[PDB]
């Protein structure tokens, strides 16, 4: 599976979660930012590694990061 | 009904200094150099500017007048160069021994060397556009007539430019006007094509016929009456064509056979000029005019009579095709992209038909034995056709992304095509592999066998034969048709099918083209290259909206670089990227077509005849034995025929030598864009920006590497320009020396 | 003290604006890990001109 | 001399270099396919081939153990570069050899 | 030194090039009528060719064994016109373009139209800078010693290392 | 020209191998990797391996 | 629970649907409730007719289901859809929305997975994890 | 003579590219900034923009 990590510069904007076409991510409560929430990656077994999440992330540098890793049928996006 | 809104858009220069006014995204202005490129890329993407179909339609109509203005300026320039800077009149007097020229260069930095010795005491660039032959057929005999046509062109250009302005700014039609497709078809069939053809028949009969008959009999141009003399003095006409004594009474009384002197069905070619008989051309245009004027009464407009296009479409459905053509009328009256796709496909296909028909049935006097013009016209019109076909693919894909809706296409032909796209593309994939192996594979077999010293094992006319028997049989049908299945035709449509060797001067105009193994092989190469180009473009269209890999592709749009390195990597999935790849295959395909033409004509058609009747072909019949290996193409075509271009320095053909090298350069430069990616370039730019920041000379518009898509666009545009201009220079240098 | 209207130099190395100057827009309450919002003239590669920083990551240049 | 190693009139000892010269051009040009066309185009095409295999009678008796996929993004760059480089050397080597043998 | 070279006026190959070039042009000339536009064009080429060869002969440019002018660019003053003097001319012009362009860029950064004035030039402002380029060497030298030419390394952005 | 440009590409490769403004954390992805996706303008051929290529 | 006997949208069929891997690896199901009969786009290409009431579709990939979900939400304002993974042995996992609420909306009860208590620039160098199983981003 | 010159220059070309490839790999996999602080190797990275530009 691909590794997805969320770093503590997250501002809880939700844009990565909204961008994700495989429902890998979700928003969870947090104290660290004004939005009182942080992105989370509980379902990385469904991550295809498209990096739409990173495209969506407004912080500099990114607060979400996708490290491409061991390929599966899921991650390779195979319908056969 | 005429429906218009008046005084819509003010005329001032306010927005000219507001770049990207037309787009919400661009109107805010640049933060980055990417904005500069986006401005140009998006300028004519009108449906991205607004959602209003009315607004889009108005811009298009007005832009079309703009295109027509540009074409009139160009046309006017050609006539003016004819009048002012050409050897037209000298050529008119001696067309066998003078080369046409209508461009003369100024003497700066030694470039006057390019003013070649074309004859008629004249020095200039030898032209290959066929203008002189066109003008001769039109009956133009002096520079005054060219000047006046040039002026008329500038008047038309100004009128088109006014209409463009007027119909955008002052009197813009409503959407309902544009959707009058029945009325548009009636007028374009009967009015534009029908009356156009009738009008040209009028010119042919009253001007071209007499003047050309006198020219061909050997009367000196200056001694021929001016066109209006034939109209005012009917006796001048009746001398040449006696049926003019009977006037128009035969027409109205249906004694049309009386006009069989100037309306003929001869076939073949005029022996003096080596062109089609103008009396056949006159009859062709009269017949076409009648058919088109009738065709343009098909559709219902403001009266009870005629067909509804919608009703025709809706009736055509059978047991294999669901709802059939239901819903197509709505597509083709609401989507400009759908219309553009069809019209580009047909216009491109037509250009290709014109290329073939004009070489084999040369319609102009002294065209056939002007080898540079024959080669140029075929090549030009093939390229225009190719580019239009790829455009059809682009606009078919844009339609699928932007204008298609499921609700409009429930179980109709469009819906049913996309529901078996895997069956279509898999079979086309297979046929491409089959064709590739059994066409190109035969050349590789032959190269291997000849290198191994086994000529008896080759596919060739003198070993294992692959005769194109069907083409050979059709050639025979066409050669025996006159006086048989075409009883009232005197001669073949074309001598390419069989029959006589036609010669003008001592040059061969046209003669039978034998088809053997080498012809069989190259025809299957064409089948191959066209099927692959189709595969790539069709795949782009059918998978534009989605695939198994990317289920939501339509949301990404027509033109996007990828959807990231995941799912194995998704570079070049977009519809746009299929057009990109399709351009290379169109380039590959058409290059071989024009190479086939060039070599076959030089080997087997063009050349000299003696008085005894001994044909001497330009490359002496080497095609049959040399064109069946890749080594033969490399050696006997590319290496041998490049001698002219490559030895051109220090002569009037030196421009072609320079263009040949220059074009190789642009081609190679394209590879920098095609083989690299912007990540590298953006990083390099960072270091360069560091040096500018250090010296307090960094721009506020921040430098960016080109977008991923722009990198591809720049790459293919330089690849095509370089590749095509190389062949242009090669062809012209060669054919101008030996032809 | 960093506050609204302060000019600050950026000391975060992974920042597009490392060693450049931006304008403080707001400072958040307390408990926020990156409370100093800064705006810049240049956009980064993603097209944004604002980012949140810690106190450690900035140094004040001008007063307000 | 090189391109006349074989021709319609016969063969000489440069025949092998003539053939290799063309082989080099072919390999080089095949490299352009991998360098210019990138992965996503091919993955979509291979999907339709997987579809056809499974739906073809007789053939669909036979089953792959490894799911066919298009080469990776990096793999394409490497395979393209390999063809480009091999083609470069196999074009120039025959030329440099046959040119000199042909002249002297 | 330059024993492999000779003055072009002493060169027999250089002279033969003139003869052969003219001989070709006179053959071309014979195809046209005296007084015709074509004839006059060829005559102009003949005159221009003669002028060129004679100019090089009188210059003291050296010729190779090919019979073509070869330029010496090692710094010796007897060949200053071949490279050193063109070089000074280039540096003066190119430095001007650079200096006035740098001056304009800095001027517009001190405005609200810093970006607008890059794509729509403030032409009066541009012409003021363009007019001031003639002493760019001194300007640039003083700017350097004042410490106004360069930013400090710590004031320019860099990537991680 | 050839020596300098080949060196440019290879040196830029080596000195930017660990990171750049476009990808400040490149060392975390290794010598060879496809890209970092189409965000931030697009990042094809950004790895140090791509400089070798 | 899913309910395997739930009716499906009306569709004439295509070649874009699922293949052998759906039968003997895993497939996905999406169910939803519609107020009215309505035409929508299949993510496997083609127009299909949504039944009024319950709707069940099967797809080969999770992304196909979610793609349809997004279309339901955006185009038809249907937000009641559910996605399941279906194994060959008959087992069924509920996937989405995992806890009833869509992931973009904060929900108490969720716990942070794969978060790190540092910024991205504070990762260790590769050399430090040389000859150990750690990653720099762990 | 021609074969031998071309052979060895091509080999040399490949070796030079490989040298730099392994230099880049070194920077990713083996370089420790802490243990090279302010030495000649670390100072190359400190002015990499000057070198590249
Ligand atoms: C056949 C060629 C052709 C035609 C008919 C058009 C037509 C048009 N262009 Mg396009 N354009 C072209 C080529 C063409 N362009 C090319 C090669 C480029 C470079 C990519 C552009 C880049 C471009 C931009 C950036 C813009 C246009 C715009 C326009 C539209 C308004 C022009 C106008 O009102 O000026 C009236 C013209 C005259 C009075 C005569 C021209 C006089 C000049 C000085 C010569 C019009 C539809 C503008 C628009 O508003 O788009 C919606 C716009 O902003 N074009
Ligand atoms: C597509 C249209 C087109 C093209 C490509 C050309 C191209 C050319 N024209 Mg033609 N011309 C055209 C239309 C065109 N013209 C039209 C419509 C007219 C009628 C107004 C003319 C009237 C014309 C004249 C009177 C002359 C040319 C000349 C030229 C040549 C030099 C122009 C130049 O250097 O500008 C220089 C730019 C300036 C702004 C001045 C060049 C080959 C010149 C030529 O052939 O010299 C021998 C020349 O004297 N043209
Ligand atoms: C004569 C003066 C004139 C003036 C002041 C205007 C003014 C305007 N026009 Mg109008 N228009 C005019 C003539 C004029 N037009 C003509 C003759 C036509 C018929 C083509 C039109 C058709 C038209 C359309 C369809 C549209 C406008 C629009 C506009 C507005 C925006 C124009 C702009 O910013 O682009 C400035 C663009 C240019 C200066 C470039 C034009 C390039 C020309 C057309 C072709 C150039 C020839 C060739 C391609 C050169 C190639 C060189 C070679 C190296 C390749 C502006 C109010 C637009 C609008 O949004 O209004 C609401 C709009 O959509 N105009
Ligand atoms: C007899 C009627 C008639 C004729 C001749 C035309 C001709 C044309 N229309 Mg069509 N049009 C018509 C009726 C007609 N239309 C009607 C009724 C509608 C509404 C349903 C339209 C709606 C329409 C649209 C929306 C568009 C066209 C366009 C065109 C042009 C297509 C491009 C081309 O082929 O250039 C051929 C070029 C020529 C033949 C030279 C120019 C001809 C000028 C305009 C005069 C022709 C007519 C004139 C009366 C003949 C004079 C005879 C003389 C002896 C006195 C062409 C000029 C397209 C276009 O390019 O618009 C600018 C376009 O977008 N038309
Ligand atoms: C009647 C013919 C026609 C018309 C009206 C259109 C109209 C359009 N096309 Mg289509 N198209 C066509 C033919 C046509 N096309 C053909 C023949 C092809 C195959 C090449 C295409 C392939 C195509 C693609 C792939 C795309 C379009 C797009 C578009 C839209 C935007 C174009 C734009 O803004 O570019 C502005 C124009 C430029 C930036 C000019 C670039 C000039 C190029 C590089 C060639 C110049 C070379 C020159 C001839 C020779 C050398 C020049 C010298 C200076 C050295 C517009 C709706 C775009 C779109 O998004 O639609 C929604 C789009 O992506 N077209
Ligand atoms: C010479 C250069 C070259 C070659 C050989 C290929 C070959 C191919 N291309 Mg590619 N292409 C190229 C350049 C090339 N391309 C470039 C530069 C681009 C970028 C624009 C592309 C972009 C591209 C696209 C977008 C597509 C193709 C497709 C194809 C395939 C077409 C089907 C076919 O012919 O199968 C038959 C194969 C051949 C004719 C190749 C040669 C066969 C040899 C001579 C015979 C076999 C020899 C023998 C068995 C060897 C055994 C030796 C071994 C045991 C040691 C074919 C594999 C298409 C495809 O996949 O179609 C289904 C397709 O869609 N190409
Ligand atoms: C390789 C570097 C190099 C550099 C930077 C210069 C630089 C200069 N030389 Mg040159 N020079 C060189 C090599 C070089 N030279 C060589 C190898 C020769 C022998 C062929 C010469 C022969 C030469 C002469 C004869 C003269 C110069 C002169 C000059 C000066 C003008 C300038 C300082 C001129 C000078 O006045 O020097 C002070 C001068 O008269 N040089
Ligand atoms: C005033 C403008 C200006 C000035 C002073 C400089 C100065 C420099 N450039 Mg930069 N450059 C510029 C514009 C400028 N550049 C532009 C427009 C581009 C995009 C093409 C570049 C692209 C560029 C690259 C890729 C590189 C440099 C480099 C350099 C440095 C070495 C010299 C060189 O290689 O130039 C080469 C630059 C060119 C050949 C580009 C053409 C320059 C144009 C003609 C100048 C434009 C003038 C402007 C329009 C004038 C308007 C003024 C008016 C309004 C008053 C030097 C610091 C090099 C470096 O970093 O060395 C350390 C380097 O590798 N430049
Ligand atoms: C063109 C000839 C095609 C004949 C197909 C037969 C034909 O015309 O069938 C036409 C047949 C007619 O169906 P309907 O009676 O429903 O048509 C009613 C129409 O009004 C609506 O389309 O359509 C089909 O059965 C689907 C087409 C399947 C096509 C499968 C084969 C495709 C590959 C063809 C390869 C040959 C190419 C040779 C080119 C020279
Ligand atoms: C006529 C040709 C002469 C022969 C060729 C030699 C040319 C040498 C010219 C280079 C001049 C050096 O230019 C100077 O470099 C040094 C070191 O990089 C910088 O000097 C400074 O850099 C940074 C701050 O910016 C700090 O490390 C320190 O304060 C200082 O070293 C200056 O910003 C720059 O002006
Ligand atoms: C993947 O492929 C590539 C990229 O990314 C997709 C690139 O980006 C680049 C680099 C090329 C760039 C950035 C475009 C070059 C543009 C030019 C020359 C600058 C334009 C400047 C002006 C108009 C000002 C000059 C002014 C005058 C002369 C008057 C290359 C080579 C490339 O291969």
mmCIF file of C-alpha atoms in Angstrom, chain F:
data_model
loop_
_atom_site.group_PDB
_atom_site.id
_atom_site.type_symbol
_atom_site.label_atom_id
_atom_site.label_comp_id
_atom_site.label_asym_id
_atom_site.label_seq_id
_atom_site.Cartn_x
_atom_site.Cartn_y
_atom_site.Cartn_z
ATOM 1 C CA UNK F 1 29.386 23.186 -25.498
ATOM 2 C CA UNK F 2 28.738 19.450 -25.156
ATOM 3 C CA UNK F 3 31.017 18.994 -22.131
ATOM 4 C CA UNK F 4 29.516 22.004 -20.319
ATOM 5 C CA UNK F 5 25.875 21.181 -21.034
ATOM 6 C CA UNK F 6 26.233 17.479 -20.170
ATOM 7 C CA UNK F 7 27.920 18.634 -16.950
ATOM 8 C CA UNK F 8 25.186 21.203 -16.274
ATOM 9 C CA UNK F 9 22.508 18.487 -16.408
ATOM 10 C CA UNK F 10 24.488 16.032 -14.254
ATOM 11 C CA UNK F 11 25.627 18.634 -11.688
ATOM 12 C CA UNK F 12 22.118 20.085 -11.384
ATOM 13 C CA UNK F 13 21.023 16.455 -10.907
ATOM 14 C CA UNK F 14 23.503 15.850 -8.064
ATOM 15 C CA UNK F 15 23.212 19.211 -6.248
ATOM 16 C CA UNK F 16 19.390 19.243 -6.453
ATOM 17 C CA UNK F 17 19.111 15.487 -5.680
ATOM 18 C CA UNK F 18 18.223 16.178 -2.025
ATOM 19 C CA UNK F 19 15.691 18.953 -2.716
ATOM 20 C CA UNK F 20 14.629 22.095 -4.595
ATOM 21 C CA UNK F 21 12.094 24.911 -4.197
ATOM 22 C CA UNK F 22 9.592 22.829 -6.202
ATOM 23 C CA UNK F 23 10.255 19.719 -4.084
ATOM 24 C CA UNK F 24 12.012 20.603 -0.780
ATOM 25 C CA UNK F 25 11.778 17.038 0.625
ATOM 26 C CA UNK F 26 13.031 15.155 -2.451
ATOM 27 C CA UNK F 27 15.548 13.053 -0.482
ATOM 28 C CA UNK F 28 12.565 11.295 1.175
ATOM 29 C CA UNK F 29 11.538 9.874 -2.239
ATOM 30 C CA UNK F 30 14.920 8.433 -3.285
ATOM 31 C CA UNK F 31 17.082 8.544 -6.409
ATOM 32 C CA UNK F 32 14.451 7.352 -8.883
ATOM 33 C CA UNK F 33 10.714 8.020 -8.762
ATOM 34 C CA UNK F 34 8.238 8.962 -11.548
ATOM 35 C CA UNK F 35 7.366 12.497 -10.436
ATOM 36 C CA UNK F 36 5.364 14.220 -7.700
ATOM 37 C CA UNK F 37 2.104 14.538 -9.663
ATOM 38 C CA UNK F 38 0.565 17.441 -11.637
ATOM 39 C CA UNK F 39 0.179 19.788 -8.635
ATOM 40 C CA UNK F 40 2.376 22.870 -8.062
ATOM 41 C CA UNK F 41 2.479 23.333 -11.856
ATOM 42 C CA UNK F 42 3.519 19.718 -12.667
ATOM 43 C CA UNK F 43 6.650 17.764 -11.713
ATOM 44 C CA UNK F 44 7.553 15.363 -14.549
ATOM 45 C CA UNK F 45 11.240 14.349 -14.558
ATOM 46 C CA UNK F 46 12.029 15.996 -11.221
ATOM 47 C CA UNK F 47 14.112 13.127 -9.733
ATOM 48 C CA UNK F 48 17.919 12.922 -9.821
ATOM 49 C CA UNK F 49 17.535 9.770 -11.950
ATOM 50 C CA UNK F 50 15.744 11.927 -14.544
ATOM 51 C CA UNK F 51 18.863 14.135 -14.710
ATOM 52 C CA UNK F 52 20.909 11.033 -15.588
ATOM 53 C CA UNK F 53 18.342 10.179 -18.277
#
